[PDB]
């Protein structure tokens, strides 16, 4: 109806009053490069709202694959991602001879032990999330010369068990995922433990989700000459890990009621 017709009311007029030399004027109307629009950009748990956007820029004929075709780093591309699920040494205590049956050799705070020190692959991420849901794969290793004998009970104890531990009858702990491992026969035990709790998620940096322990099934029968320093080591791997709740750096957050 008007206010834009500036192009065909000048482009035509000349095209109507043109001679063999052609039109003496050309007029074109259109919208400005800077139009009235709004741009929104979302990254991980973030949203940037801009109402005065500008044409995004970038280098000449750029390549954003970001993958080094020469593989100057021979590793899997998802190495850094899976790194926190890596197998790690959770504990190593010494089986002190003369320890009656039932005696607890060593324990391990599950799952906060995987972030035991700032030198743990999972320690990094674990600090930026308050909630966790994961599966475990333990490998308790105990080496003893052939001359010696004995047996230890590697068992997983959920918070329920750990809470009421004294109320439970030892010798029945075989009801829990365990590995009566007879020394001089086995040097390592394997335990695959899924997420077990009375809550969908467990607070990061908590002893919840139970804890893995190692008891004395039958004390060590170490002959005279045989060595007497048996070490028990607990290794742990995360079959599957999941950090959800965001939070400040290593700040105690209550996911529970």
């Amino acid at each position: 109806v008007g206010n834009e017709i500036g192009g065909n009311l000048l482009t035509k007029v000349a095209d109507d009053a043109s001679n063999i030399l052609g039109p003496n004027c050309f007029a074109t109307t259109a919208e400005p490069e800077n139009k009235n629009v709004v741009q929104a950009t979302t990254t991980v748990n973030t949203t940037n709202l801009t109402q005065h956007p500008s044409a995004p820029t970038m280098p000449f004929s750029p390549d954003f694959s970001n993958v080094d075709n020469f593989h100057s780093m021979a590793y899997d591309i998802t190495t850094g991602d899976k790194n926190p699920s890596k197998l790690v040494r959770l504990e190593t205590h010494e089986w002190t001879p003369s320890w009656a049956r039932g005696y607890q050799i060593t324990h391990v705070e599950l799952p906060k032990v995987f972030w035991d020190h700032q030198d743990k692959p999972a320690y990094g991420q674990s600090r930026y999330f308050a909630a966790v849901r994961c599966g475990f794969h333990f490998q308790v290793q105990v080496n003893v010369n052939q001359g010696t004998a004995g047996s230890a009970l590697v068992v997983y104890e959920p918070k329920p068990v750990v809470t009421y531990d004294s109320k439970l009858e030892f010798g029945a702990f075989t009801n829990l995922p365990h590995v009566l491992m007879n020394l001089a026969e086995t040097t390592q035990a394997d335990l695959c433990i899924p997420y077990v709790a009375d809550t969908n998620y467990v607070k990061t940096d908590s002893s919840d989700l139970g804890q893995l322990k190692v008891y004395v099934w039958t004390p060590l029968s170490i002959p005279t000459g045989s060595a007497n320093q048996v070490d028990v080591t607990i290794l742990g791997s995360l079959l599957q890990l999941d950090f959800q709740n965001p939070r400040v750096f290593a700040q105690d957050v209550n996911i529970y009621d």
């Binding site: 280098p59 000449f60 004929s61 750029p62 390549d63 694959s65 970001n66 080094d68 075709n69 020469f70």
Partner: peptide, 9 residues
Amino acid sequence: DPRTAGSKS
């Protein structure tokens, strides 16, 4: 290797 330069050519 153009990639290291962020270019495709």
